[PDB]
Amino acid sequence: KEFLAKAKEDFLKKWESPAQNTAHLDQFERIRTLGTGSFGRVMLVKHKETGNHYAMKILDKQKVVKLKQIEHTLNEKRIQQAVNFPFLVKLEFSFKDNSNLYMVLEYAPGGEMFSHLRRIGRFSEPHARFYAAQIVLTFEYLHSLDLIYRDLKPENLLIDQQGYIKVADFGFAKRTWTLCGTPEYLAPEIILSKGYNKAVDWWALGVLIYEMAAGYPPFFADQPIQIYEKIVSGKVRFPSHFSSDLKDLLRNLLQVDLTKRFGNLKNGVNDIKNHKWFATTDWIAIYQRKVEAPFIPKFKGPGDTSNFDDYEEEEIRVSINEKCGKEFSEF
Ligand SMILES: [NH3+]C[C@@](O)(c1ccc(Cl)cc1)c1ccc(-c2cn[nH]c2)cc1
Ligand code: NA
């Protein structure tokens, strides 16, 4: 708890006295889209002076307001510039014009983890274990800031050139969009509009590990309603190739009973770290990035993007009238 005790202090220092790294939008050349979302997209950009590459998130200000995500966006930004953790995406710069918010992020050239997963079918248990370790640490870190990841979106788990995970989200403090739309990853307590705490993240961890090891999520159906029924049921078919160690962990993680769910017990996350499945895991070496990654992305070019999918390229139009000024004044 040495690396996290201080990185909690560092968060508060940076929170309260933010840096003002200065670039201008005009310095970045838009190249191609790395991903799309509800209220924007992430462009790969090249710095016109250095030739260095970044991932620029472009949010339409109006669409953020029309979907009531202002507070979340402002918060997400402030959290992100304040955190320094090895498996969280750094914010480099941020700007705004009339139409858009712009957030220049550190580029993770290895693409989304789940495109490597579809490509190879399923991860081996060491391979899955390697990634899960980073997530555990990331979740432990986020928890020490009273942040909760809540909804796992595995499209948001990126891979860097060293083959380590970069997580793109920072959770929430304290949307039927998410419930109805992305159902496979919801914890039971969220489906049944009960309370939820840090323990939903350990459910998410369970789903993630299962999907990595299996190649598909543990609760799947055609209509979302059936999925909900499965999640709350507390019943999961394990593939036959799952070790009994893995099966055991997943029963404890995918526990519907909050009070018995691993991570949420007396010893907290140490239940998880000291599980037989993680016996071979050097937690310090993972944090310090000294474990050799099982997959290292192939770097064909300087701004090579073949590790991300293709997307249609909208024109980034900018109004000559400032939109949503007061709303994003503090952004
Ligand atoms: N998978 C998440 C999304 O695709 C994304 C796309 C649009 C929006 Cl509004 C939010 C998130 C994404 C893609 C790439 C990156 C990225 C690449 N390098 N560094 C960050 C981050 C998020
Ligand atoms: Na404001």
Amino acid occupying residue 155: E
Residues 60, 133: one domain?
Answer: no
Non-local (6+) Cβ contacts of 78 within 8 A are: 15, 18
What is the 65 CA–ligand 2 centroid distance (Å)? 12
Per the domain annotation, does 293 fall within a domain? no
Does 41 contact ligand 1 (Cβ within 6 A)?
Answer: yes
Nearest bound ligand to the CA of residue 327: 2
Per the domain annotation, does 12 fall within a domain? no
Non-local (6+) Cβ contacts of 268 within 8 A are: none
Non-local (6+) Cβ contacts of 175 within 8 A are: none
Per the domain annotation, does 141 fall within a domain? yes
Q: How far is CA 223 from CA 152, 190, 238, in A?
A: 20, 18, 22
Choose one of 28, 30, 34 to mutate for the ligand 1 pocket test, by most ligand atoms within 8 angstroms of C-beta: 34
Distance of CA 279 to the CA centre of its chain: 25
60 has catalytic annotation: no
Residues 266, 322: one domain?
Answer: no
Residues 223, 270: one domain?
Answer: yes
Task: For residue 11, give the nearest of 159, 142, 128 by alpha carbon.
Answer: 142
Closest ligand 1 atom to the C-alpha of 58?
A: 9
Active-site residue (options: 26, 60, 151, 245) = 151
Per the domain annotation, does 2 fall within a domain? no
Choose one of 32, 42, 89 to mutate for the ligand 1 pocket test, by most ligand atoms within 8 angstroms of C-beta: 42
Which technique was used to obtain these atomic coordinates? X-ray
**What resolution does the deposited structure have, in angstroms?**
2.8
Does 55 contact ligand 1 (Cβ within 6 A)?
Answer: yes
Per the domain annotation, does 11 fall within a domain? no
Q: Which residues constitute the domain of residue 311?
A: 18-109+299-326
Residues 59, 72: one domain?
Answer: yes
Given a contact cutoff of 8 angstroms between Cβ atoms, the answer to whether 25 and 98 are in contact is no
Protein residue whose Cα sits closest to atom 3 of ligand 1: 35
- CA dist 290 and 18 (Å) reads 30
Nearest bound ligand to the CA of residue 34: 1
CATH number, domain with residue 151: 1.10.510.10
What is the 42 CA–ligand 2 centroid distance (Å)? 24
Amino acid occupying residue 228: Y
What is the 101 CA–ligand 2 centroid distance (Å)? 14
Residues 253, 160: one domain?
Answer: yes
Buried b (16+ CB within 10 A) or exposed e, 22-33: ebebeebeeeeb
Non-local (6+) Cβ contacts of 189 within 8 A are: 195, 196, 199, 200, 258
Q: How far is CA 52 from CA 103, 299, 301, 305, in A?
A: 16, 14, 12, 14
Nearest bound ligand to the CA of residue 39: 1
Per the domain annotation, does 331 fall within a domain? no
Does 45 contact ligand 1 (Cβ within 6 A)?
Answer: no
User: Which residues keep their CB under 5 angstroms from ion ligand 2?
Assistant: 329-330
Question: Which stretches of 145-187 are DSSP H helices?
Answer: 176-181
Residues 198, 264: one domain?
Answer: yes
Protein residue whose Cα sits closest to atom 5 of ligand 1: 35
Domain count within the chain: 2
Task: For residue 307, give the nearest of 46, 166, 108 by alpha carbon.
Answer: 108
CATH number, domain with residue 26: 3.30.200.20
What is the H or E stretch that residue 96 is in?
strand 91-96
Per the domain annotation, does 136 fall within a domain? yes
